[PDB]
Design an enzyme around this catalytic site. Structure first.
Site, mmCIF file in Angstrom:
data_model
loop_
_atom_site.group_PDB
_atom_site.id
_atom_site.type_symbol
_atom_site.label_atom_id
_atom_site.label_comp_id
_atom_site.label_asym_id
_atom_site.label_seq_id
_atom_site.Cartn_x
_atom_site.Cartn_y
_atom_site.Cartn_z
ATOM 1 N N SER A 18 -6.446 3.384 3.619
ATOM 2 C CA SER A 18 -5.733 2.107 3.686
ATOM 3 C C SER A 18 -6.268 1.133 3.084
ATOM 4 O O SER A 18 -6.175 0.311 2.854
ATOM 5 C CB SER A 18 -4.653 1.262 4.093
ATOM 6 O OG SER A 18 -3.996 2.580 4.823
ATOM 7 N N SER A 61 0.605 -1.316 -0.111
ATOM 8 C CA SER A 61 -0.313 -0.012 0.033
ATOM 9 C C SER A 61 0.782 0.994 -0.115
ATOM 10 O O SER A 61 0.205 2.667 -0.433
ATOM 11 C CB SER A 61 -1.428 0.147 1.568
ATOM 12 O OG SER A 61 -1.624 -0.922 0.679
ATOM 13 N N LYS A 115 -0.452 3.501 -2.654
ATOM 14 C CA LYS A 115 -1.464 4.576 -2.077
ATOM 15 C C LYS A 115 -1.109 6.203 -3.223
ATOM 16 O O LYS A 115 -1.316 7.137 -3.327
ATOM 17 C CB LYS A 115 -1.533 4.924 -1.557
ATOM 18 C CG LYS A 115 -2.878 2.901 -1.064
ATOM 19 C CD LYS A 115 -3.468 3.031 -0.727
ATOM 20 C CE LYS A 115 -4.781 1.969 -0.534
ATOM 21 N NZ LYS A 115 -3.480 0.062 -0.347
#
Length: 248
Positions: A97, A49, A52
């Site tokens: 997230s 993640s 992102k």
């Protein structure tokens, strides 16, 4: 003006927590690289993640969402984090997230377009698998801590060909702690390659009339200890900053 590699207490934090991996920091004003283990800083692993950060730049530049307040519609499927179980905008999806939001948005973007951004961003091995809505969690795409930092420096300097609005929104949503001493932008990610759990915390901190870019990447083989390390990764980073005099 070239960089310098700084001249053991950082490795001690890893040793005392029975983890490998490393912390890498770049002092922007002074152009100094700080390594707990310089060779680990060159090793690529899946971004999970932490992707992102680039994905948020891409979503705005490609008009997946108009801004960070535009909600994407939740499919009504209950997932295991309650904050995910509602319509979410980009700011919220980043903070929480929320994988589903990024997977859904990636469907609006062709694989070749993603490859263009991975080239612009010098983003690791720049590999996109056939899983074009999840290549950042499937071990195809991989990036080293050094490469995370170089990407973050270019973001900070706004060197990529992106619009002013894209940069302004992403720099704002990235702020997850602000005090009178410092403004911290940091994003976690984690996954597993083989028997090794990979726990990232990457970003940059504005402090001391300077900027410190960082990429912490914990390698953990212990199943029993992984949840603690997920809770500890940001505090480990703050401990490294205090050890280096970056914050009090």
């Amino acid at each position: 003006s070239n960089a310098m590699v700084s001249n053991v207490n950082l490795q001690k934090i890893f040793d005392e927590n029975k983890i490998t991996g490393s912390v890498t920091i770049y002092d922007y004003k002074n152009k100094i690289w700080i390594y707990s283990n310089e060779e680990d800083s060159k090793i690529r692993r899946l971004p999970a993640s932490t992707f992102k950060i680039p994905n948020s730049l891409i979503f705005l530049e490609e008009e997946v969402v108009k801004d960070e307040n535009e909600a994407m519609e939740w499919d009504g499927i209950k997932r295991y984090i309650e904050n995910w179980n509602k319509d979410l905008n980009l700011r919220e999806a980043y903070e929480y997230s929320a994988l589903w939001f990024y997977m859904k948005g990636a469907g609006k973007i062709k694989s070749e377009k993603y490859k263009e951004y991975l080239k612009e961003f010098n983003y690791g091995n720049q590999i996109v698998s056939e899983k074009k809505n999840s290549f950042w969690i499937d071990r195809s795409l991989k990036i080293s801590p050094e490469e995370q930092i170089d990407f973050l420096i270019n973001l900070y300097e706004e060197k990529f060909m992106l619009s002013e609005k894209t940069y302004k929104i992403v720099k704002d949503i990235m702020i997850n702690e602000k005090t009178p001493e410092y403004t911290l932008r940091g994003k976690t990610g984690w996954g597993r390659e083989g028997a090794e759990n990979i726990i990232w915390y990457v970003g940059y901190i504005e402090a001391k009339e300077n900027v410190y870019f960082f990429a912490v990447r914990i390698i953990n083989a212990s199943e029993e200890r992984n949840s603690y390390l997920l809770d500890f990764r940001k505090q480990l980073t703050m401990m490294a900053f205090r050890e280096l005099g970056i914050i009090n």
